[model samples]
Target: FQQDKFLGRWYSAGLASNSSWFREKKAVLYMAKTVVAPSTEGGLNLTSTFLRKNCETKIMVLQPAGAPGHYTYSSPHSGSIHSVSVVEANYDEYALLFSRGTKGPGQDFRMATLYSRTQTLKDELKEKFTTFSKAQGLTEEDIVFLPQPDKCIQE
Candidate 1:
């Protein structure tokens, strides 16, 4: 959980989630560039670029929880509280993260994202991602490796 070491640009190498949006668009979803930086409150401000109908951007403000690599994000719109844990953060190569979004008692979704320092990920890391996802209850069908690259990576 080296916070400073993890701050940089990373490529979204793989993802596995229970969200309908991710499942339906998995095939078309490409690698996205995400930049994570330190926030004012000793948290992390994570921003990513996506190629949607247009080149859109998404942001997440993670507040440090009980530990160094554990954080939380509360979505105002969806009323979902996201718990993010840097399950394995090898700053120089890859980062395997797990996130669970809970919307009160009604809805919830679990997601695992693999972030690589480069655009491509290693086979060993990919295997780790799959098993981690399975441990989190995500089926084989839910896991996906980004097959393309996002041209709108740089701004």
Candidate 2:
């Protein structure tokens, strides 16, 4: 996961999978992406940006201090896909985790995804992300794949 792979902008991609046990349903399922920027103010600050199918773009300012690359979203819909992304080029891949809101370890949420930077992925990479998720206590069913966009641009 070269951090650079996550530096550019990405589209919503699309849902790859989700857990039926905690899913209420994807409300609007908007396209999402994240830009990896260094925090001048220090700490791992990442600016999250997303636009939901012609809707207004939603942005969140986050710092990855305690979460280490994770951001605790105030709204269930808040996150930067690249935050938890795997940076090693040969190993790991993009993975995002979100919840209904701020809550305990058992709080149910929706829309967890394991995505790649491109349109498709190899069987090995998919299996790797799946195994990692399961080891974290999430099942393969707990995740969904976010569709890779035809083209995602970043300036």
Error of 2 at 134 (Å): 1.7
Give the whole-model CA lDDT for all candidates, comma-separated: 0.85, 0.42
lDDT (tens digit, per residue) of candidate 2 on 64-126:
534344443333333223233222243134444432232336643344454444545567766
Per-residue CA lDDT of model 1 for 1-155, tens digit only, reads: 67999998998988999876676777778788899999878999889887775577888899998899999988733566888898997899999989888655757789898999988677899899999999988989999998555367866
RMSD each, Å: 2.1, 5.8
TM-score of 2: 0.52
- Model 2 residue runs over 4 Å out of place are 1-6, 10-22, 27-31, 43-56, 66-74, 78-102, 105-115, 148-155
Specify the highest-lDDT model's number. 1
Lowest lDDT sum, 10 consecutive residues, model 2, at: 79-88
